[PDB]
Amino acid sequence: GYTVAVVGATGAVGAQMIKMLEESTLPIDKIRYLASARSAGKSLKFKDQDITIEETTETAFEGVDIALFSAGSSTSAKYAPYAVKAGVVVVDNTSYFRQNPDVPLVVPEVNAHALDAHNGIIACPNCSTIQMMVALEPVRQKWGLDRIIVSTYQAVSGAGMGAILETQRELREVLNDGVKPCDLHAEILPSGGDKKHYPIAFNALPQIDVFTDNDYTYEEMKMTKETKKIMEDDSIAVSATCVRIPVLSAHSESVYIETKEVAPIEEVKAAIAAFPGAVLEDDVAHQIYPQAINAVGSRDTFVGRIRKDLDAEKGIHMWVVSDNLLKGAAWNSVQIAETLHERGLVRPTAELKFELK
Amino acid sequence: GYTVAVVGATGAVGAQMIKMLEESTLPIDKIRYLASARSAGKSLKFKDQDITIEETTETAFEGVDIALFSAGSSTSAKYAPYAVKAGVVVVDNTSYFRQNPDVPLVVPEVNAHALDAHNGIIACPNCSTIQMMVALEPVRQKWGLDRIIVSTYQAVSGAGMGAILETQRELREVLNDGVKPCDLHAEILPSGGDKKHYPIAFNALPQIDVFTDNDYTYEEMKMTKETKKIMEDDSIAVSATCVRIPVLSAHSESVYIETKEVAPIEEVKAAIAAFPGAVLEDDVAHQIYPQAINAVGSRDTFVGRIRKDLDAEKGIHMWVVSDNLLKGAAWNSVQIAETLHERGLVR
Ligand SMILES: NC(=O)c1ccc[n+]([C@@H]2O[C@H](COP(=O)([O-])OP(=O)(O)OC[C@H]3O[C@@H](n4cnc5c(N)ncnc54)[C@H](OP(=O)(O)O)[C@@H]3O)[C@@H](O)[C@H]2O)c1
Ligand SMILES: NC(=O)c1ccc[n+]([C@@H]2O[C@H](COP(=O)([O-])OP(=O)(O)OC[C@H]3O[C@@H](n4cnc5c(N)ncnc54)[C@H](OP(=O)(O)O)[C@@H]3O)[C@@H](O)[C@H]2O)c1
Ligand SMILES: O=C(O)c1ccc([N+](=O)[O-])cc1P(=O)(O)O
Ligand SMILES: O=C(O)c1ccc([N+](=O)[O-])cc1P(=O)(O)O
Ligand code: NA
Ligand code: NA
Ligand code: NA
């Protein structure tokens, strides 16, 4: 079996990583939980076993076969290269390595073949990107994709445990204490790493991550760039608006595409139904469509409201929902680890291709 | 001055109609409040004076100069023709008359001229449509509009007082009692008039109004049809996805357009800033963009996140926010009534 390390085991994603590993098909001989020095020395469960949390350091990866990183880009930048140097295969949830040409950027149902060429780090795309790729790959395969316009409705758990607690606190202040939403004090959202903070309670914040120099946010540009890499087609036009809403878990997306060939609408429904990891939930006669509150806890990605554009012959609109901590993060990463195991790719890399920081 | 009747004075929109009328430049000699038989006899304020709510009937409209209807399509269908007959000018908030070719469908900043052709009824458009029209008209005027694709983030007050209360109760059950959102009982949302009801707490419901035969909802199709009528151009392609989110007041919209001519972004920003009723809030270097919580209580429509599409030469994305009970409903209606007064059309 393997020795598996979870880096960021104490976080929002980390907690789901533990659950996904407990339920995985990976043969696990030893589990290690890694976090900051603040958590090091405390205890967390794996199934019924108590596991002592360790500090993430350049030397924490000895004997580890597979490490799953969900501790923020800076932690991955700092330590993933040392893990690779120790002989580990790293599956990284963060944005840091995603656009590195030596790093496969993988959703297993879509581009598992890219795993074959790994150099010790495999990147998991952004949560919003993953669920969109699951929904759209079955369409791309049959009718092609010319462009994508997406508007997201993103849950707060993607911003971490603190963001969840801040959201809960704000909502209670309004509903229990009678605080006006515009009077709320916020410290984290929309972005922990930005200068100003705004309430999320009863609000819709059109900022996820920080702004880039083209006036799209980093989250929007992640969707654009990761789509082109995952689908291996730079010709796919992608523009996104990423909005945080008061949901704790599960992202929703209003997705518009134009295909290359006209795609019969009922066949689009059938192709999505037929695609592993995608569930067709679409019966408007009975008000059946994907809903965030129903998707929480499931590894599947749910797709409905599928319908042609009123004017563009090749245009299609749909609604895509998935649990952002599962298929959006922890489940995609554990699925990657299972795929690596199943295809004989869990082995130390020959040459180091990543800068030590 | 005028005798003004508010039909549906007791509802979410009606309460704002009262507020907007109290703050209006309309000369009001007499105010009357009308609702259903079960609200009749109760009392409600207009400024400092107590007004008795009356039951809406076929003959209740005697003496009235202006009637503002915000009591749902069925009430307007039933009673508005009788008010017109009695010589009242009706301003109707509902969907019922909006696509009647003899009824002006008006956003005063955009198509006030259409009021000149009225035959006793003027329709106020759908809330989501109104704020979109305020944002996009200044662009249409200079560079044209070829198509619109919009995804909305709609507040629950658009579904009435019941929906607001249902949303608050659901959220408290989750946060205070630890009920899972998927276990909540719901009676109103997504649509009071549809068969199945779903929780809105911690959710996003991709249904507003009921479904039509082409699998878009009536809400989505209103945005399409009302846009074409208001802008008086059937060639503007419009497709919408309308979603309810856990916000009590103020709708937000992610709006994509393609213009007919390339519209430089700084000029687009300046055209929107120049347009009455639109306020530019767009300074991403200081994280300035419209937000629902800041828009509540203002009659303005706020526009930001304005940027070029990454690929389409003529494509532009933006973010549009307005209080749905104000510019989206009660303020648009009162502004129509003021415009009627100012232009001598209260006949
Ligand atoms: N200060 C507050 O008011 C506040 C509010 C909410 C939660 N918290 C607690 O503080 C922790 C951080 O909150 P969060 O919202 O950032 O959690 P999170 O975003 O959901 O997860 C962050 C993960 O990254 C790990 N991490 C952070 N710095 C690291 C480093 N230098 N090396 C390796 N791993 C590192 C964290 O470990 P650590 O757990 O060791 O930091 C945690 O496992 C949480 O575990 C939570 O229990 C504090
Ligand atoms: N006083 C009572 O004991 C009592 C009992 C039941 C309901 N209600 C009222 O019913 C409303 C139910 O909430 P909601 O979410 O449906 O409100 P809403 O959508 O926010 O507003 C609906 C408005 O339309 C009016 N209306 C409905 N049917 C009508 C008819 N046949 N003729 C004329 N006006 C009509 C309502 O008056 P009404 O207020 O008369 O419905 C109300 O003013 C509440 O606003 C409440 O005021 C009052
Ligand atoms: O931005 C992201 O996509 C992202 C997603 C997940 C995680 N994580 O630690 O699980 C971290 C990041 P980010 O690159 O740190 O912001
Ligand atoms: O659906 C609508 O557009 C709408 C909007 C406002 C009001 N109202 O009574 O203020 C009613 C309707 P609807 O046509 O009753 O559903
Ligand atoms: Na499937
Ligand atoms: Na094998
Ligand atoms: Na057109």
Side-chain angles (χ1 to χ4, degrees), chain B residues 34-176:
Chain B
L34 280 61
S36 82
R38 48 172 54 198
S39 299
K42 291 168 53 199
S43 191
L44 225 45
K45 298 266 173 171
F46 182 84
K47 311 204 185 182
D48 290 330
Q49 204 194 325
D50 280 296
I51 312 292
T52 300
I53 299 142
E54 313 169 53
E55 176 184 357
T56 310
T57 68
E58 276 98 332
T59 52
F61 292 102
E62 290 278 34
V64 182
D65 296 299
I66 308 163
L68 300 156
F69 274 70
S70 58
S73 292
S74 59
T75 313
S76 290
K78 267 173 276 175
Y79 302 99
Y82 287 92
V84 167
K85 195 168 172 292
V88 180
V89 187
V90 173
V91 182
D92 186 34
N93 275 96
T94 82
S95 58
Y96 189 74
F97 299 104
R98 298 192 185 130
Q99 303 299 320
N100 190 309
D102 296 315
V103 179
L105 180 62
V106 181
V107 178
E109 296 87 349
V110 179
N111 68 338
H113 59 89
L115 294 165
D116 298 346
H118 87 82
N119 305 288
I121 306 165
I122 295 102
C124 174
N126 167 258
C127 44
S128 310
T129 301
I130 296 168
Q131 66 187 62
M132 191 168 69
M133 293 300 96
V134 174
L136 291 183
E137 174 64 5
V139 186
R140 190 201 60 81
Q141 283 172 2
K142 294 170 178 281
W143 305 276
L145 289 179
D146 197 24
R147 79 183 291 193
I148 305 165
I149 301 169
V150 52
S151 295
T152 72
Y153 294 66
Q154 289 174 240
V156 303
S157 54
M161 196 68 72
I164 301 167
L165 298 171
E166 164 168 288
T167 303
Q168 288 166 319
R169 185 265 304 163
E170 286 174 13
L171 290 162
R172 284 189 320 256
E173 286 187 320
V174 179
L175 287 156
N176 296 340

Side-chain angles (χ1 to χ4, degrees), chain A residues 23-307:
Chain A
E23 298 173 3
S24 78
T25 53
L26 222 44
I28 306 172
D29 284 347
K30 186 179 180 180
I31 290 279
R32 297 177 60 193
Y33 289 164
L34 275 58
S36 78
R38 293 176 309 267
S39 293
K42 303 180 193 178
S43 204
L44 226 44
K45 293 286 197 185
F46 183 80
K47 295 177 181 176
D48 50 3
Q49 302 255 106
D50 300 318
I51 306 288
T52 305
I53 302 164
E54 303 176 61
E55 180 186 2
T56 308
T57 64
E58 303 93 309
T59 59
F61 299 96
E62 304 313 303
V64 176
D65 300 298
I66 302 166
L68 310 175
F69 278 70
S70 63
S73 277
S74 169
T75 302
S76 286
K78 290 194 259 106
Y79 302 109
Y82 291 94
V84 172
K85 197 148 236 310
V88 183
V89 182
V90 168
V91 178
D92 185 22
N93 278 285
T94 80
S95 67
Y96 194 78
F97 293 103
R98 291 194 187 129
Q99 304 300 326
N100 182 311
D102 293 320
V103 172
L105 178 65
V106 175
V107 180
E109 297 91 342
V110 182
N111 64 338
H113 68 85
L115 296 166
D116 291 352
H118 82 80
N119 295 288
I121 298 176
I122 300 86
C124 182
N126 171 265
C127 44
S128 298
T129 306
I130 300 174
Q131 66 185 65
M132 187 170 76
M133 296 296 93
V134 177
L136 295 186
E137 175 63 8
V139 184
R140 191 198 63 77
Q141 276 170 3
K142 291 194 183 231
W143 302 282
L145 287 176
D146 199 7
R147 77 181 300 190
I148 300 171
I149 298 169
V150 57
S151 288
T152 76
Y153 299 68
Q154 287 176 236
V156 302
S157 69
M161 284 305 318
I164 300 170
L165 292 170
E166 163 168 291
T167 301
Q168 291 172 322
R169 193 252 313 155
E170 288 174 14
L171 286 162
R172 286 179 182 119
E173 284 169 353
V174 181
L175 290 161
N176 299 335
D177 296 337
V179 182
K180 284 178 152 75
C182 54
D183 287 326
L184 292 165
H185 179 72
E187 312 179 81
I188 300 171
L189 295 162
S191 171
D194 219 338
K195 294 194 179 69
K196 297 159 71 169
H197 306 283
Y198 302 127
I200 186 61
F202 303 102
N203 204 12
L205 289 168
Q207 177 189 350
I208 301 191
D209 214 305
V210 299
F211 285 92
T212 79
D213 62 4
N214 77 358
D215 300 342
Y216 284 72
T217 66
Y218 266 97
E219 192 85 342
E220 294 152 1
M221 292 316 299
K222 292 172 203 158
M223 298 190 79
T224 293
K225 292 185 259 167
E226 297 171 15
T227 294
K228 295 168 184 283
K229 182 168 178 173
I230 294 154
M231 281 176 163
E232 300 177 355
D233 189 350
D234 281 322
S235 78
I236 305 171
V238 182
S239 281
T241 301
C242 293
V243 181
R244 194 83 69 181
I245 61 161
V247 172
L248 302 186
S249 271
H251 290 344
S252 306
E253 302 166 338
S254 175
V255 174
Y256 174 79
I257 62 171
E258 288 170 5
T259 55
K260 295 281 198 179
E261 312 277 310
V262 171
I265 204 61
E266 291 296 302
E267 293 186 23
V268 172
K269 295 186 185 170
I272 291 167
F275 190 78
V279 171
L280 179 71
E281 280 192 323
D282 200 337
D283 177 3
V284 302
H286 308 280
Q287 292 174 266
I288 298 309
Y289 34 70
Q291 297 182 41
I293 62 174
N294 294 332
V296 173
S298 166
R299 297 167 176 73
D300 278 324
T301 291
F302 301 91
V303 192
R305 298 295 324 276
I306 295 155
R307 63 206 192 281

Side-chain angles (χ1 to χ4, degrees), chain B residues 42-339:
Chain B
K42 291 168 53 199
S43 191
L44 225 45
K45 298 266 173 171
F46 182 84
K47 311 204 185 182
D48 290 330
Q49 204 194 325
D50 280 296
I51 312 292
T52 300
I53 299 142
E54 313 169 53
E55 176 184 357
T56 310
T57 68
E58 276 98 332
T59 52
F61 292 102
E62 290 278 34
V64 182
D65 296 299
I66 308 163
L68 300 156
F69 274 70
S70 58
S73 292
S74 59
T75 313
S76 290
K78 267 173 276 175
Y79 302 99
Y82 287 92
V84 167
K85 195 168 172 292
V88 180
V89 187
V90 173
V91 182
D92 186 34
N93 275 96
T94 82
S95 58
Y96 189 74
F97 299 104
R98 298 192 185 130
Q99 303 299 320
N100 190 309
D102 296 315
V103 179
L105 180 62
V106 181
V107 178
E109 296 87 349
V110 179
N111 68 338
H113 59 89
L115 294 165
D116 298 346
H118 87 82
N119 305 288
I121 306 165
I122 295 102
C124 174
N126 167 258
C127 44
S128 310
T129 301
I130 296 168
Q131 66 187 62
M132 191 168 69
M133 293 300 96
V134 174
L136 291 183
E137 174 64 5
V139 186
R140 190 201 60 81
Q141 283 172 2
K142 294 170 178 281
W143 305 276
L145 289 179
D146 197 24
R147 79 183 291 193
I148 305 165
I149 301 169
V150 52
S151 295
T152 72
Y153 294 66
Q154 289 174 240
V156 303
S157 54
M161 196 68 72
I164 301 167
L165 298 171
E166 164 168 288
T167 303
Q168 288 166 319
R169 185 265 304 163
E170 286 174 13
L171 290 162
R172 284 189 320 256
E173 286 187 320
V174 179
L175 287 156
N176 296 340
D177 293 332
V179 178
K180 296 150 51 161
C182 63
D183 285 343
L184 291 164
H185 189 253
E187 283 173 12
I188 295 151
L189 295 159
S191 174
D194 218 343
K195 302 182 199 158
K196 300 212 257 165
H197 306 280
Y198 303 124
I200 185 62
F202 302 97
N203 204 14
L205 290 171
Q207 184 190 346
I208 297 180
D209 211 314
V210 304
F211 284 94
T212 79
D213 201 53
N214 74 2
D215 299 334
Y216 287 73
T217 63
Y218 278 90
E219 189 80 346
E220 292 153 0
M221 291 309 303
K222 289 170 209 159
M223 293 191 81
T224 292
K225 294 179 169 179
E226 296 174 9
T227 291
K228 294 167 187 278
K229 185 171 183 170
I230 294 155
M231 288 181 155
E232 303 175 359
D233 190 349
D234 288 322
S235 80
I236 300 163
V238 187
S239 293
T241 301
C242 298
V243 182
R244 191 79 69 183
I245 60 167
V247 171
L248 303 186
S249 265
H251 289 347
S252 310
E253 302 171 337
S254 175
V255 180
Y256 173 78
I257 63 173
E258 283 167 4
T259 54
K260 284 182 171 308
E261 308 293 339
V262 176
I265 291 298
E266 294 309 306
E267 291 176 17
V268 167
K269 289 178 180 179
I272 292 170
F275 194 75
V279 172
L280 181 70
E281 294 194 317
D282 199 335
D283 178 7
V284 301
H286 299 105
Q287 300 170 258
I288 301 305
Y289 32 72
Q291 303 184 33
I293 61 178
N294 292 333
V296 176
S298 165
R299 291 160 179 84
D300 281 324
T301 295
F302 301 90
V303 186
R305 299 295 326 276
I306 297 164
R307 61 211 194 280
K308 285 183 185 293
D309 191 81
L310 293 174
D311 298 275
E313 184 179 29
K314 294 175 186 182
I316 297 173
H317 301 262
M318 59 184 81
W319 182 248
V320 181
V321 179
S322 197
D323 187 324
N324 58 299
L325 299 180
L326 298 183
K327 187 54 178 171
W331 162 240
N332 196 73
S333 290
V334 170
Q335 187 182 26
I336 287 171
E338 291 168 349
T339 307

Side-chain angles (χ1 to χ4, degrees), chain A residues 340-344:
Chain A
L340 291 163
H341 160 70
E342 289 159 12
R343 301 184 179 205

